[PDB]
Amino acid sequence: MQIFVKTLTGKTITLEVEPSDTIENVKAKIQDKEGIPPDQQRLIFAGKQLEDGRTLSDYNIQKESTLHLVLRL
Amino acid sequence: MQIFVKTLTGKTITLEVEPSDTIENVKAKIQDKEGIPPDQQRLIFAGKQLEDGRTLSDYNIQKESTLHLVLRLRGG
């Protein structure tokens, strides 16, 4: 399934993932496409900062959902 | 009953299953014979991607049927 990760600069990127993939896996994909180290990524969905060890289905992230990407200060 | 699972190279994998087994069980048996994690397996039959929660009989898969195995690349 496809999900979207949006920056606050209005850029949206598309990732191919399965519900079983971890947040850490998503961060790795983001590092590959955008060069941002995973330790600097905060992903946000449903008002929560997403923990690395959980899966997308653990957060009820589904096809075409959007996650927010912010950098850590 | 026996079913067959073909890979992209045309290699054949023979599995012993029952009609009441789920697609998720079939992927487990593929993992045990071939070492491929189930999260990386897509199974195709009669032009459909097969959903994990359904049984073989739900997809009218019978003895000596052949399924196609395609894999996902970690990392896209």
Residue numbers in the entry:
A (entry chain A): 1 to 73
B (entry chain B): 1 to 76
Task: Provide the authors' own sentences about this structure as they appear in the paper.
The asymmetric unit (ASU) contains two K29-linked diUb molecules. The distal Ub is bound via its C terminus to K29 of the proximal Ub, and there is visible electron density for the isopeptide linkage. In the crystal structure, K29-linked diUb adopts an open conformation. Contacts between the two isopeptide-linked Ub molecules are entirely polar and involve R42 and R72 on the distal Ub and E16, E18, and D21 of the proximal Ub. The hydrophobic I44 patch (made up of L8, I44, H68, and V70) and the I36 patch (made up of I36, L71, and L73) facilitate the majority of interactions between Ub and UBDs. Like K63 and M1 chains, these hydrophobic patches are exposed and accessible in the observed K29 diUb structure. The crystal structure reveals an extended conformation, but in solution, K29 chains may adopt other conformations.
